[PDB]
Assembly symmetry: D2
Homo-oligomer: 310 residues x 4
């Protein structure tokens, strides 16, 4: 029975973690969130300890550890800028970390975490559910059979209501900006499929749209990211869809929205089986996303312009 603590319990994504912990036969020992709108927790783990103050949470988990009943994992569902320091808290307390994406905001934070693993005997893992999406695992096998770099069009639209622009998600110091907070999913998919980015361009940047181009070891990629649902293709909009997440490559197209929200238990299962996504796996997309925070806009060549900018 794997022992978990959880940060960010009051949040949107937290119930998916509570479900994962239940489904892998784990127990939630304690949670942290400065907000107390967490009453849903009793329907999953009615005996879990709860803290509003991170310093009190830390002291409690240390007391559990300084006596043999420590947690095995800290699940981290706090705002992005808190992932790094809460992962360090976990490792120091003798727990593995399982952090939401992006694992951290900066490449310097990845480098420091690699050193800290070696001094604490624990490991840092991250939630990248696209890496367990059955359609994308199948695409990955297909693409591996083919020599040469591929040409890819990546379109990632996921609608967000008006609350998003009043939240931490649009504070770049907290979220990393749109290309990190939302785009890390696809920058990570592209690194997993096609390796390291040799060249990066950004062609459009507004509060709701970013678009650009990547030259990766295995592919040339035109990409478009939005949180404005008007960019969902019209035939799908008609049927009420608010998302469109598509990779077109090698003469095929895979739209990977189905089950996007139903893969957190599989990520937990892979992680507890020792097949999790660690620092080495997460680092490349974080490097790309971080470069994009400060990269100047450029004018795309026609070959490099995503079609939604045409």
């Amino acid at each position: 029975m794997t022992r978990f603590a959880l940060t960010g319990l009051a949040g949107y994504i937290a119930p998916r973690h509570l479900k994962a912990i239940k489904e892998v036969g784990g127990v939630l020992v304690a949670s942290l969130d400065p907000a107390t709108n967490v009453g849903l927790v009793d329907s999953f783990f009615p005996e879990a300890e709860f803290f509003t103050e991170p310093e009190a949470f830390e002291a409690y988990l240390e007391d559990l550890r300084d006596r043999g009943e420590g947690v095995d994992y800290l699940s981290i569902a706090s705002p992005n800028h808190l992932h790094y320091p809460q992962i360090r808290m976990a490792l120091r307390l003798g727990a593995n970390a399982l952090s939401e994406k992006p694992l951290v905001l900066w490449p310097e934070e990845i480098a420091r975490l690699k050193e800290l693993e070696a001094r604490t005997g624990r490991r840092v893992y991250t939630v990248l559910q696209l890496r367990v999406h059955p359609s994308l695992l199948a695409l990955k096998e297909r693409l591996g059979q083919e020599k040469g770099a591929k040409d890819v069009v990546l379109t990632y639209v996921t609608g967000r209501g008006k609350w998003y622009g009043k939240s931490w998600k649009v504070d770049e110091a907290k979220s990393g900006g749109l290309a990190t907070n939302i785009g890390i999913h696809f920058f990570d998919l592209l690194a997993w499929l096609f390796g390291r980015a040799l060249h990066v361009e950004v062609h459009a940047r507004t509060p709701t749209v970013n678009a650009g181009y990547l030259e990766l070891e295995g592919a040339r990629v035109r990409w478009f990211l939005s949180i404005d649902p008007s960019f969902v293709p019209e035939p799908l909009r008609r049927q009420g869809k608010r998302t469109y997440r598509s990779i077109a490559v090698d003469g095929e197209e895979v739209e990977f929205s189905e089950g996007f929200t139903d893969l957190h238990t599989e990520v937990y299962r892979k992680t507890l089986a020792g097949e999790g996504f660690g620092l080495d796996e997460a680092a490349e997309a974080i490097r790309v996303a971080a470069l994009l925070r400060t990269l100047p806009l450029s004018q795309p060549s026609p070959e490099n312009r995503h079609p939604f900018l045409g």
Copy 2:
């Protein structure tokens, strides 16, 4: 299409109000919550406006009024002490109010609300789902047949985890205390069935237990309230059950937990149909609960002592 604005969107009970507004064919025009952990809202009303600052939400709703697009109803799912001033906001904005229980904390607030309903021509309503619970409607009908007052044992145990003690729920200025925040359900049930309280006693009053006695026009009632699930009767507790909500009238048992969390849409419907629970309906249980904040403890006679007290 009834037009609603909602306060308390990030909270535990908010999704039941989103489901109710949906199911009655209403539209959520705008919501208010100082917390922004509200991403669930896009799965219901992906175009609703959102505010963290009450002053800005008010100015926005005042602008809508002034241009003939005012909201019809403010639904209120904020902490209890904010119900009164949020209902004052609804009324001044030219909207009706539908507030979670307890409707307000104090009888003086009920009295001032009556004045403001007269000044504004608007109405104040509240969510008391026990009044639409089919077993309790059935009970009320059977009691109408009967002559004389009844002897009643009311036992109300609903377990709460460790987060509750770190929330506004235990700040008596915010919540009104245990007998208000949780007990209002049953004080209101008893007022609805049995009328006004002629005499009130409190026999036990700790952070997790209140017990006492009421003499009502239609009943003598021994009551016990707890948020410690250890008080669930042993034959249910041994199975892991954490709630027990029972009214026993002249020795006949009605346990009413089933469907307790599945009646908000029916309250909303009754309200919109002119059958809502207004100030006059809610006032008596508020008067009882408010008395209980300062009523001195007394030693029960054996005939007035709830069985759980020994």
Copy 3:
């Protein structure tokens, strides 16, 4: 005895408002702040009500109004995005408003307040302390005696520590951005002295520097604003100074640091006498600051580039 309520009581700036209210013979009936380090209030108005919830503060003031004991002014010292909706509250409660700068963030908000003033017969005022100052007030009479366009270089560097970057003051939706949160003082001084901005350019807009160029009816202005103290001129910086606040008009300087934390009381007095700074006085700087946060960057000509760039 003029009755006041105050918003933003916990904030850096509220003590000058407590002094003005005291000094002008007013009484503070109630205050609002989400935060609770407001104890200083006890040494001025030891009986004032206090609220952390805006809706409870509004209901309390509305009760007072309805029984004929309403406040006469709402003084507003909250973060900038709250000024507009708190002035709206003041007018709905039948009070005048006296707001910190910037009075509101957007010209559309000014227009709405003008409608609402007419509806309620109450007035919106703002604290423009540079306008009652001795050394800036000196200019306006002189300058005004001469004709011809002036050539102005405006430089303001006011160092801010690491806390600033973690506060609402860098959230553009809350503060209006650097030029507004720092700038607005001086854009208002410039509009006061030299009229409407007929051309506006922004040359730099980074998190610690905003710089640009204005042409006003009465002057051209090269301006530079920063909260990075490394831009304090070296003869001051070498001494450890972290601020520098200069307007040079046709080669003639005035530096501005001295009477800066100073003149809230006179502004209260003028306002109470019917000589306050209203929407019409405030609007132009608000229009310019709204452009300064929204216009695209452009590359300056040599002639139009502030020397510090």
Copy 4:
């Protein structure tokens, strides 16, 4: 040059700590507060780091420690329940702690901190400025010359406006209650003069008044504590005084309000000189204050009743 970090920078007492660090020739390296009303700091330590997130503050200080540049002291001016876990943070960072009163809330926390001191070779100190108040030091000397149990009337009135009741200071879980948050000063003065409390009674306990009776090894003590300035004696009220802090014993009375707010630098100097008030010194008043939280009210005998209750 003694290196400090500070918690609670945006609050009421912090400016006194900034002044103290400056006056003892220290440097403030970094500060933590979730609130950002802190601009004052620039007039003292213009280059200090600042954090809103405790986990980021702790990671920053951990980095300093690891590269041989750790702070020497953590000064703690956060809410009272945070003192214990922030002192734990200091000790694990290899810093001494200098915490505002009360040092911690509970005797069990004192006991844990004694164990952690021994582990780390760092020390915990606290601000008890009455122990450096010249009038009280002079009184202590005068009393010493005697022998036999003293008879004491302690009256401690310190006015607070309406903001206090909407702050953390009235949340007993955060502040310890009135007898702890305000009262610790005088319980500590009494323990310093007269030793262990062998008998404790509480006679009144309202939001603005606590009163009771103690018998200590060296004195019997009738005490009264209020934040209602109406209890300042009329003659002092008539001249506008809002405090009255009086100890009457041995045929004299010492009123110790003068300079009560001007002794923080002296506490810092004593602490840096190795003459600070440690766990052993602070423990007894913490034990007494904690007992008073749960002690039921009793009816006083006339002899044991503070005069202000008569």
